[PDB]
Design an enzyme around this catalytic site. Structure first.
Site, PDB file in Angstrom:
ATOM      1  N   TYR A   1       2.391  15.249  41.092  1.00  0.00           N
ATOM      2  CA  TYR A   1       3.351  14.324  40.508  1.00  0.00           C
ATOM      3  C   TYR A   1       2.969  12.879  40.745  1.00  0.00           C
ATOM      4  O   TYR A   1       3.700  12.045  41.314  1.00  0.00           O
ATOM      5  CB  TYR A   1       4.786  14.678  40.969  1.00  0.00           C
ATOM      6  CG  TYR A   1       5.757  14.162  40.185  1.00  0.00           C
ATOM      7  CD1 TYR A   1       5.809  14.716  38.914  1.00  0.00           C
ATOM      8  CD2 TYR A   1       6.671  13.178  40.551  1.00  0.00           C
ATOM      9  CE1 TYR A   1       6.764  14.294  38.013  1.00  0.00           C
ATOM     10  CE2 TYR A   1       7.629  12.751  39.649  1.00  0.00           C
ATOM     11  CZ  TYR A   1       7.677  13.308  38.383  1.00  0.00           C
ATOM     12  OH  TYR A   1       8.638  12.907  37.476  1.00  0.00           O
TER      13      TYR A   1
ATOM     14  N   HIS B   1       6.235   8.325  34.321  1.00  0.00           N
ATOM     15  CA  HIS B   1       7.130   8.321  33.193  1.00  0.00           C
ATOM     16  C   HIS B   1       6.655   7.291  32.143  1.00  0.00           C
ATOM     17  O   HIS B   1       7.108   7.331  31.010  1.00  0.00           O
ATOM     18  CB  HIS B   1       8.588   7.967  33.527  1.00  0.00           C
ATOM     19  CG  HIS B   1       9.156   9.032  34.424  1.00  0.00           C
ATOM     20  ND1 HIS B   1       9.166   8.911  35.807  1.00  0.00           N
ATOM     21  CD2 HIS B   1       9.727  10.213  34.095  1.00  0.00           C
ATOM     22  CE1 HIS B   1       9.732  10.002  36.305  1.00  0.00           C
ATOM     23  NE2 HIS B   1      10.060  10.784  35.289  1.00  0.00           N
TER      24      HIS B   1
ATOM     25  N   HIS C   1       9.195  21.776  34.001  1.00  0.00           N
ATOM     26  CA  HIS C   1       8.509  21.413  35.259  1.00  0.00           C
ATOM     27  C   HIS C   1       8.341  22.683  36.124  1.00  0.00           C
ATOM     28  O   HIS C   1       7.376  22.793  36.875  1.00  0.00           O
ATOM     29  CB  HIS C   1       9.364  20.425  36.062  1.00  0.00           C
ATOM     30  CG  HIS C   1       9.163  19.023  35.548  1.00  0.00           C
ATOM     31  ND1 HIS C   1       7.913  18.517  35.286  1.00  0.00           N
ATOM     32  CD2 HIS C   1      10.068  18.055  35.269  1.00  0.00           C
ATOM     33  CE1 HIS C   1       8.080  17.254  34.850  1.00  0.00           C
ATOM     34  NE2 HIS C   1       9.365  16.922  34.832  1.00  0.00           N
TER      35      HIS C   1
ATOM     36  N   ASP D   1       6.770   4.017  40.065  1.00  0.00           N
ATOM     37  CA  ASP D   1       6.966   5.303  39.374  1.00  0.00           C
ATOM     38  C   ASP D   1       5.833   6.266  39.651  1.00  0.00           C
ATOM     39  O   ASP D   1       5.254   6.892  38.751  1.00  0.00           O
ATOM     40  CB  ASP D   1       7.099   5.007  37.880  1.00  0.00           C
ATOM     41  CG  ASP D   1       7.469   6.148  36.980  1.00  0.00           C
ATOM     42  OD1 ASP D   1       8.249   7.020  37.370  1.00  0.00           O
ATOM     43  OD2 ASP D   1       7.004   6.194  35.809  1.00  0.00           O
TER      44      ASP D   1
ATOM     45  N   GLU E   1       4.671  15.041  33.101  1.00  0.00           N
ATOM     46  CA  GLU E   1       5.823  14.507  32.372  1.00  0.00           C
ATOM     47  C   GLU E   1       5.710  14.708  30.857  1.00  0.00           C
ATOM     48  O   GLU E   1       6.689  15.075  30.198  1.00  0.00           O
ATOM     49  CB  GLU E   1       6.007  12.984  32.620  1.00  0.00           C
ATOM     50  CG  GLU E   1       6.587  12.652  33.995  1.00  0.00           C
ATOM     51  CD  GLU E   1       7.834  13.422  34.214  1.00  0.00           C
ATOM     52  OE1 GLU E   1       8.709  13.596  33.317  1.00  0.00           O
ATOM     53  OE2 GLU E   1       8.338  14.056  35.119  1.00  0.00           O
TER      54      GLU E   1
ATOM     55  N   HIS F   1      13.153  20.035  29.240  1.00  0.00           N
ATOM     56  CA  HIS F   1      12.149  19.167  29.874  1.00  0.00           C
ATOM     57  C   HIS F   1      12.077  19.554  31.357  1.00  0.00           C
ATOM     58  O   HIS F   1      11.024  19.848  31.942  1.00  0.00           O
ATOM     59  CB  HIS F   1      12.535  17.673  29.750  1.00  0.00           C
ATOM     60  CG  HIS F   1      11.690  16.734  30.561  1.00  0.00           C
ATOM     61  ND1 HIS F   1      10.807  15.809  30.043  1.00  0.00           N
ATOM     62  CD2 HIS F   1      11.712  16.538  31.907  1.00  0.00           C
ATOM     63  CE1 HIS F   1      10.244  15.149  31.073  1.00  0.00           C
ATOM     64  NE2 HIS F   1      10.748  15.588  32.250  1.00  0.00           N
ATOM     65  N   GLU F   2      13.270  19.635  31.998  1.00  0.00           N
ATOM     66  CA  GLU F   2      13.280  19.930  33.439  1.00  0.00           C
ATOM     67  C   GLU F   2      12.876  21.367  33.746  1.00  0.00           C
ATOM     68  O   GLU F   2      12.064  21.589  34.664  1.00  0.00           O
ATOM     69  CB  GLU F   2      14.668  19.643  34.028  1.00  0.00           C
ATOM     70  CG  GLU F   2      14.897  18.131  34.171  1.00  0.00           C
ATOM     71  CD  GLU F   2      13.881  17.365  34.902  1.00  0.00           C
ATOM     72  OE1 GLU F   2      13.217  17.778  35.854  1.00  0.00           O
ATOM     73  OE2 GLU F   2      13.666  16.175  34.520  1.00  0.00           O
TER      74      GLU F   2
HETATM   75 ZN   LIG Z   1      10.076  15.159  34.116  1.00  0.00          ZN
END
Ligand SMILES: [Zn+2]
Ligand SMILES: [Ca+2]
Ligand SMILES: [Ca+2]
Ligand SMILES: [Ca+2]
Ligand SMILES: [Ca+2]
Ligand SMILES: [Ca+2]
Ligand SMILES: [Ca+2]
Ligand SMILES: [Ca+2]
Ligand SMILES: [Ca+2]
Ligand SMILES: [Zn+2]
Lengths: 316, 316
Positions: free
Chosen positions: A157, A231, A146, A226, A166, A142-143
């Protein structure tokens, strides 16, 4: 470091044994020369200064409990590199074999892991909410996804583009977890979240509402927390992506699944060719429809399922 | 880059002209070789990939409106380096002249600026909430002070230790703003916040409650947002630090001010000698009392004012 490429052995966060690529030069370092310009794993030693020290080990055996998060960060960055190369013919995150660097043991009791624009950073968790976050292959992928998005679409973002950002990371994190066939599922972070509770996870792509995230555009979050719900509102896109892959009927709308492989080809094409920094959900739908059209034809079942899934989550 | 040290001229975010240290090697780069291992300023070109490209300019004159944030990032990192060296005899943030790197033009319409563990990052603001954040010397010094804290006390970024972390950054950001005598005040971020409203700021150290932040320990925030209130609960410490410096009567408790210079010596000593990663407010008070004792004697007026200020904001 300059040295000889070799193979060491250790144990990851979950107790499983695995071989990892290392480099020898006096000590054995977590430096994998077999992929691109290299994969490098550092010890941040419980501080927030980055990247910390390149991980050095005296005997190439990584079975200490302090070693665990490093083994998995290093190993799962390799699996993620392999997925993108083998499946999508992309060499590392910039498309030109950039070196992948990760630091583990960041801060103390830190419940998170993130791509900071230049490298991966993983906390060890507080031991109650999380255990070291690099033990989750879907978190790692997932990271690292990015970083791919930063070099291609560049989705900012915040608000809908951040939520796409996301969701794209959840989708590819999940596809990497299926690629490695690591007990695969459509949940995010279940291997490292709440060691004391069985069965839960951080998010769910198959039913985002189980944790209170929206599964329809009419339920989107419109406030400021957020960064505008990046998210939270990613649940709308995650549910669309699950439906395109697996099929199902959602708020009365039926979707024929076309499977994971085509899901990954459509979204990867949409991410690297049609999305821009300020794309919003409606332009994600146009980008996904155009990608499926490019690949399978405007009268294909793949185009029809992409339209049905976005119609099912209310995205026009 | 390897080249010849020279001096260029430009205009900052607020329209003021200033000389900046540059390096010539075909182009003129924002690379200052006169301080430590160097101060380097990069263009992130509206992307989130870091650090971006070292800033290059064809004629050593930086009067373009795209140049403005770079001029001020580079120039105010120099002033902050000079403050710590001249006042506190500290060479750069690690105490060993580490190079200071900053990237400007990060992302699009990004309302923030931060130390990421390895370098400074500045957004341009959306033009309504903020203008480019490097135009605020107290923002620049606030963020560079996180690098100092990371190398010394190592205060983790959550609950009371994170609030100390944030307050220490506000205090030294404000002392640097007085050191450069840049229209100094006890507010944070007033030069770059809301270009359309005169008189407001982000936070206030002299009256934190003006923006709704707590000015007494009995009003602290106890939930989970903002990592346990690190930006909110820092108001309790900011008000203590303002009282130690300037004096005043607060919830009936009178404090004789001892001035800015001693305030900076006491807190710098407390930060680099007594605070640890998990210090909480009560141990900050003990650390500040011990520092003032080391420097001025246990029966000094400086020790007495430190105790009165923490008693005034309810910290025992
Ligand atoms: Zn993320
Ligand atoms: Ca070993
Ligand atoms: Ca799983
Ligand atoms: Ca999973
Ligand atoms: Ca669990
Ligand atoms: Ca020029
Ligand atoms: Ca001012
Ligand atoms: Ca100020
Ligand atoms: Ca204003
Ligand atoms: Zn801060």
């Amino acid at each position: 470091i300059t040295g000889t490429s070799t193979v060491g052995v250790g144990r990851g966060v979950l107790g499983d044994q695995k071989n990892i690529n290392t480099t020898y030069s006096t000590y054995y370092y977590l430096q994998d020369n077999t992929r691109g310009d290299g994969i490098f794993t550092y010890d941040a030693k419980y501080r927030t200064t980055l990247p910390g020290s390149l991980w050095a080990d005296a005997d190439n055996q990584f079975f200490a409990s302090y070693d665990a998060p490093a083994v998995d960060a290093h190993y799962y960055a390799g699996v993620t590199y392999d997925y993108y190369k083998n499946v999508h013919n992309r060499l590392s995150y910039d498309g030109n074999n950039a070196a992948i660097r990760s630091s583990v043991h960041y801060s103390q009791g830190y419940n998170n892991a993130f791509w900071n624009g230049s490298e991966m950073v993983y906390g060890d968790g507080d031991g109650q909410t999380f255990i070291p976050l690099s033990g989750g292959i879907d978190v790692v992928a997932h990271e690292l996804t990015h970083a791919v998005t930063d070099y291609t679409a560049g989705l900012i973002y915040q608000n809908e583009s951040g939520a796409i950002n996301e969701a794209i990371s959840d989708i590819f994190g999940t596809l990497v977890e299926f690629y490695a066939n690591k007990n695969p599922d459509w949940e995010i972070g279940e291997d490292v979240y709440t060691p004391g509770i069985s069965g839960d996870s951080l998010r769910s792509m198959s039913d985002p509402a189980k944790y209170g995230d929206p599964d329809h555009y009419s339920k989107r979050y419109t406030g400021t927390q957020d960064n505008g719900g990046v998210h939270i509102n990613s649940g709308i896109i995650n549910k669309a992506a699950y439906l395109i892959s697996q099929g199902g009927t959602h708020y009365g709308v039926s979707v024929v699944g076309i499977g994971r492989d085509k899901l990954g080809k459509i979204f990867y094409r949409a991410l690297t060719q049609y999305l821009t920094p300020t794309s919003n959900f409606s332009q994600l739908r146009a980008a996904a429809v155009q990608s499926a059209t490019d690949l399978y034809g405007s009268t294909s079942q793949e185009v029809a399922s992409v339209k049905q899934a976005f119609d099912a989550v209310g995205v026009k």
